[PDB]
Amino acid sequence: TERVFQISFFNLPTVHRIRDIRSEKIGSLLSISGTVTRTSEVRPELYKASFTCDMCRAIVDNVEQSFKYTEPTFCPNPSCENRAFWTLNVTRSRFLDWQKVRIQENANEIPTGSMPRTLDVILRGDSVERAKPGDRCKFTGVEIVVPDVTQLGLPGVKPSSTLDTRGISKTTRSLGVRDLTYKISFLACHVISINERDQEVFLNSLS
Amino acid sequence: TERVFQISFFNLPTVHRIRDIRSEKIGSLLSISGTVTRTSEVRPELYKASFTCDMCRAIVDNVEQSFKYTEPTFCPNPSCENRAFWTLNVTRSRFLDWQKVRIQENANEIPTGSMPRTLDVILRGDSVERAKPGDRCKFTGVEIVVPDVTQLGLPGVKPSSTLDTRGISKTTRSLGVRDLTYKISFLACHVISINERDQEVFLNSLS
Numbered sequence: 001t002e003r004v005f006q007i008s009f010f011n012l013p014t015v016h017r018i019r020d021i022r023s024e025k026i027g028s029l030l031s032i033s034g035t036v037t038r039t040s041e042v043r044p045e046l047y048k049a050s051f052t053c054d055m056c057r058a059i060v061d062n063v064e065q066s067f068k069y070t071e072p073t074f075c076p077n078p079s080c081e082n083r084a085f086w087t088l089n090v091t092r093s094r095f096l097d098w099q100k101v102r103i104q105e106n107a108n109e110i111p112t113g114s115m116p117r118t119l120d121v122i123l124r125g126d127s128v129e130r131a132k133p134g135d136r137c138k139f140t141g142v143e144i145v146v147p148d149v150t151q152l153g154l155p156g157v158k159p160s161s162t163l164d165t166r167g168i169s170k171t172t173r174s175l176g177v178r179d180l181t182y183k184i185s186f187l188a189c190h191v192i193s194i195n196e197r198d199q200e201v202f203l204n205s206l207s
Numbered sequence: 208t209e210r211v212f213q214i215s216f217f218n219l220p221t222v223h224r225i226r227d228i229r230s231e232k233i234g235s236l237l238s239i240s241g242t243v244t245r246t247s248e249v250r251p252e253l254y255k256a257s258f259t260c261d262m263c264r265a266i267v268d269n270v271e272q273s274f275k276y277t278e279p280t281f282c283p284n285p286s287c288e289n290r291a292f293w294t295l296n297v298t299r300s301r302f303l304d305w306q307k308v309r310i311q312e313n314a315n316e317i318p319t320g321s322m323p324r325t326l327d328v329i330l331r332g333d334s335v336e337r338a339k340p341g342d343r344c345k346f347t348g349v350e351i352v353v354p355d356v357t358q359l360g361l362p363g364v365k366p367s368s369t370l371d372t373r374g375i376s377k378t379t380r381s382l383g384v385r386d387l388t389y390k391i392s393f394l395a396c397h398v399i400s401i402n403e404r405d406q407e408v409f410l411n412s413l414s
C-alpha cells in the first residue's frame with residue numbers, strides 16, 4: 001500500500017540519565033542511556049486501522065492510530081451519520097513492530113543511597129531487537145506519557161477532567177469524568193550499544 | 208427501463224353472464240358482459256417493487272409483484288442472510304395503471320324474482336378509462352379471486368391454513384393460521400362497449 005518511513009535521529013549533543021528525565025521535556029527529542037534488563041517479543045501495533053460501520057457496512061481505511069485506539073468520527077457515506085459504533089477488522093488493518101525495552105540506570109549513575117530507576121522504552125519499526133538484556137544502550141527519541149492507573153492513592157491532587165456543561169441547553173447523569181494520571185515513558189527511534197564467528201566478516205568491517 | 212406489454216385477447220366464442228360465473232373457471236380466459244355503474248380513478252399499482260434491506264442498505268430491484276405485496280427472500284449481498292426485514296422505496300419502484308369497474312347484470316339477464324348481481328372488474332394498463340358509468344360493456348380477461356374477510360359468520364366450514372408442524376425438531380406458540388376466504392373478481396385485458404363533435408372525423412371512420 002504505502003511505505004512507512006522511520007526518521008532516526010542520532011548524535012545528540014548531550015545524553016541524559018534516567019533520573020535527569022523531567023516533565024518539561026515531554027514530547028521532545030532527546031537522548032538517554034541505560035542498561036537493558038528486559039526486552040518484549042516484537043508485537044504488532046495497530047498503525048492504520050480499518051473500520052466497518054454497523055449501519056453502513058462500507059470500509060473506512062487509513063484511520064491513523066497516533067498513540068491509542070481511535071475510532072473515526074464521520075462515515076464515508078453521507079446518509080449514515082454515525083460516529084460511535086464501529087468494528088475493527090484486523091486483516092484489513094495495518095501494523096508496526098513494537099518492542100518494550102526495560103532499562104535500568106547504569107551502575108555509575110545511581111546516586112548515593114538511592115536505588116536504580118527503571119524506564120520502559122518503546123522500540124518501533126526497524127529498531128526492534130536492536131537491544132538485548134545486559135547491554136548498556138543509549139536511545140534517541142521522544143519522551144512521552146502513558147496512562148498510569150497505579151497513581152491512585154498517591155498523595156496530592158491527582159488531575160481529572162470533566163465535560164463542560166455550559167452552552168448545553170438543559171430542559172427541566174452525563175458525568176464523563178476521567179483520571180488524568182500519567183507516567184513518563186520513552187519512544188526510541190534509534191538504538192546503539194555503548195555473528196562475528198566468521199573471521200573474514202570481522203576483519204572486513206574494521207579500521 | 209423496460210416496456211410492459213399488454214396482450215389483449217378478444218373475440219371469444221362465447222360471452223358469459225355475471226350469474227354464469229363459477230369457481231371452476233378461476234384463473235382462465237373468458238368473456239363477460241355487464242352494465243358499468245361505478246369506475247375508480249386510475250390509481251398506481253405496484254408492479255416491480257424495489258426493496259432496501261435494513262442490514263445491507265443495497266437496492267434490490269425488479270421484485271415482481273404478481274398479485275399482492277411480496278417482499279423478496281434472498282439479499283443480493285451474500286453476507287447479510289436476511290429474508291424478513293425490507294423497506295419499499297416508492298420512487299425507485301415501478302407502477303401500472305389500475306381502475307376498478309363495478310358492473311351490474313344487464314336488465315335482460317336478471318332472472319325471475321332475483322336481484323341484479325355486481326362484479327368488480329380490474330382494468331390494467333391501456334384499458335383504463337375505456338368504460339364509463341351507464342355503458343353496457345363486454346370484458347375479456349381472467350376470473351381471479353381476491354381476499355374477502357366479510358365471509359366471516361357465513362354458514363359452512365370456511366377453509367383455513369395451518370403450518371405443518373412435523374419434521375420441525377421441537378425441544379421439550381407458532382400458530383400461523385390464516386383465513387382462506389375469497390371472492391370472485393375479474394381482471395380485464397380488453398374492454399369494448401356494446402369527441403364526435405367534429406363532423407369530418409365522424410365521417411372519416413365510417414363504412
Ligand SMILES: Nc1ncnc2c1ncn2[C@@H]1O[C@H](COP(=O)(O)OP(=O)(O)OP(O)(O)=S)[C@@H](O)[C@H]1O
Pocket residue numbers: 038039040041043100
Ligand atoms: N508464558 C510464557 N511462556 C514462555 N516464555 C515466556 C512467557 N512469558 C514471558 N516469557 C519470556 O519472556 C520474554 C519476554 O517477552 P514477553 O513476555 O512477550 O514480554 P514482556 O517483557 O512480558 O512485556 P509485555 O509488557 O508483556 S509487552 C519472552 O520472549 C519469553 O522468553
Ligand SMILES: Nc1ncnc2c1ncn2[C@@H]1O[C@H](COP(=O)(O)OP(=O)(O)OP(O)(O)=S)[C@@H](O)[C@H]1O
Pocket residue numbers: 245246247248250307
Ligand atoms: N372524497 C371524495 N371527494 C370527491 N369526489 C369523490 C370522493 N370520493 C369519491 N369521489 C368520486 O367518486 C369517483 C370514484 O373514484 P374513487 O372514489 O377513487 O373510486 P371508488 O369507486 O371509491 O373505488 P375504490 O374502491 O375506492 S379504488 C371519483 O372520481 C370522484 O368523482
Ligand SMILES: [Zn+2]
Pocket residue numbers: 053054055056075080081082
Ligand atoms: Zn456509518
Ligand SMILES: [Zn+2]
Pocket residue numbers: 260261262263282287288289
Ligand atoms: Zn440484507
